[PDB]
Design a protein around this ligand. Structure first.
Ligand SMILES: *C(=O)N1C[C@H](NOS(=O)(=O)O)CC[C@H]1C(N)=O
Length: 279
């Protein structure tokens, strides 16, 4: 039993009248196709594309071009300034090197902007990641900018975009374990499960302790609007099977609490739809 009528209707009451454009992808483990909402919109990804980036970094690790214990120079003055980076507060000193593995964990789990931009340097920039996304057979998405360019120009975020179909496909290609070695896959799943970002988004209305591998993303506000409040992830159902849910709240005039509640409510509806199929 795939996407069926009261699921699409619960989603209907969650977004109708909200001053935002809400992208939705729901792919339960018995669905041939994802349920999509606003499938024709281009949703700015913000931090969500650190998942795509990590998959490319770990695929180049799997191909030997890089190594997880390979060191990278982090210079406090050289890197992207005045930005979100737990790495530049965790580590003291004017210059230090960290392993690619810690760059990955910082970018994926802590959504770190400096670590993310250093991984862009090692793989060949946004154009490397744009080619990789296409190489997975995902067409309706684009990546042209890094974190530094997005911080420099707030309109540039709209060109690092994905469609809801493309959001489902990357979540599926991550979840299905076929794009990466077993060691690389297992690190990415760990980083996506162990994040403490966005607790009120996909995890917000799920029972405590529900395993959710997910990547958040959020823009800043401008003139009382938030261009993007996103969360994309894999919910582990009680039988161990995956439920893929992505929600992208675009150009919202609602409060942050409402934007996250929208994400949470969709994830809950998809979740409870799957729970009644079992015990
Ligand atoms: C990611 O979108 N960002 C990095 C950082 N983490 O926020 S997140 O949990 O929504 O991913 C702060 C905001 C944002 C950015 N400006 O880069």
């Amino acid at each position: 039993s795939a996407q069926s009528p009261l699921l699409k209707e619960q989603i209907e009451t969650i977004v109708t009248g909200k001053k935002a454009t809400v992208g939705v992808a729901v792919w339960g483990p018995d669905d041939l196709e994802p349920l999509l909402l606003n499938p024709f919109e281009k949703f700015p990804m913000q931090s969500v594309f650190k998942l795509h980036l990590a998959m490319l970094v770990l695929h180049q690790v799997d191909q030997g071009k890089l190594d997880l214990n390979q060191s990278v120079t982090v210079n406090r003055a050289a890197v992207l300034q005045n930005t979100w980076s737990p790495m530049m507060k965790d580590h003291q000193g004017d210059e230090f090197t960290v392993a690619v593995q810690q760059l990955l964990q910082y970018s994926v789990s802590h959504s770190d902007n400096v670590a993310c931009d250093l991984l862009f340097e090692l793989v060949g920039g946004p154009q490397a990641l744009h080619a990789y996304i296409q190489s997975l057979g995902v067409k309706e998405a684009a990546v042209v900018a890094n974190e530094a360019q997005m911080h420099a120009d707030d309109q540039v975020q709209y060109q690092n975009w994905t469609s809801m179909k493309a959001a489902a496909q990357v979540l599926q290609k991550f979840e299905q374990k076929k794009q990466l070695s077993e060691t690389s896959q297992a690190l990415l799943w760990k980083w996506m499960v162990e994040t403490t970002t966005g607790p009120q988004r996909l995890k917000g209305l799920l029972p405590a302790g529900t395993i959710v591998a997910h990547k958040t993303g959020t823009s800043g506000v401008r003139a009382g609007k938030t261009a993007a409040t996103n969360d994309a992830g894999v919910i582990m159902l009680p039988d161990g099977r995956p439920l893929l849910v992505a929600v992208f709240v675009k150009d919202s005039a609602e409060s942050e609490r409402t934007n996250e509640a929208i994400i949470a409510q969709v994830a809950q509806a998809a979740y409870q739809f799957e729970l009644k199929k079992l015990s």
